[PDB]
């Protein structure tokens, strides 16, 4: 387990910079354990290493890296970038859910179908006279009742 350091990068250059650092790491056998460029973080990537000087070294000669924040990032503050599980996992036809964000917020619905490939759920609203299938993002629902 290395420590987590934030590295400043040019906006739009997160993935490209991760990849150039990775190339240099491989060429010189630098003791960097991992690198993380969350699509929701713009202008910073994170580099897991034993200490800060190993990152300062690795980013030298890398055009779009602007420096390493001195204060390490606790591991808990990157964990929420690390969840591989679709938010729909566990939902089954017939389950009862609430929509919790977006236009249908507060409304309850019955699960018709999950698409874990796209992390979406197709639902029929409870109050609707005409039961039309609505597909919502997996993050916008919460399970109320299993069937």
């Amino acid at each position: 387990a290395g420590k987590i350091f934030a590295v400043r990068v040019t906006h739009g250059q997160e993935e490209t910079t991760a990849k150039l650092i990775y190339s240099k790491v491989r060429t010189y056998n630098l003791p960097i354990y991992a690198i993380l460029a969350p699509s929701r973080v713009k202008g910073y990537i994170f580099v897991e290493a034993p200490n800060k000087g190993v990152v300062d070294e690795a980013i030298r000669g890398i055009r779009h890296a602007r420096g390493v924040l001195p204060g390490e990032v606790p591991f808990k503050e990157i964990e929420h970038f690390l969840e591989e599980k679709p938010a729909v996992s566990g939902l089954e036809p017939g389950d009862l859910v609430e929509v919790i964000a977006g236009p249908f917020k507060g409304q309850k619905a019955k699960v018709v179908k999950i698409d874990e490939s796209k992390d979406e759920v197709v639902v029929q609203f409870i109050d609707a006279i005409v039961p039309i299938p609505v597909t919502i993002k997996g993050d916008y629902v919460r399970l109320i009742s299993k069937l």
């Binding site: 387990a1 354990y33 991992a34 993380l36 699509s39 591989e84």
Partner: protein, 60 residues
């Protein structure tokens, strides 16, 4: 063109996943992780990466 595997999340340019064998690859993916040292990495242990390389966290 860089595709992520839906099954073990490795990134590959080719038409099957070189780590698990799956053909279920997506051009649609977010959050690039690169694991250099599987043994030393807390990132790798947390995501359960076993093989050094590129991974996507969210495969869509």
């Amino acid at each position: 063109s860089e595709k992520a595997c839906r099954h073990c999340h490795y990134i590959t340019s080719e038409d099957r996943c070189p780590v698990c064998g799956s053909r279920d690859l997506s051009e649609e993916w977010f959050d690039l992780v690169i694991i250099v040292d599987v043994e030393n990495s807390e990132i790798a242990k947390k995501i359960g990466a076993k093989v050094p390389g590129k991974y996507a966290i969210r495969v869509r």
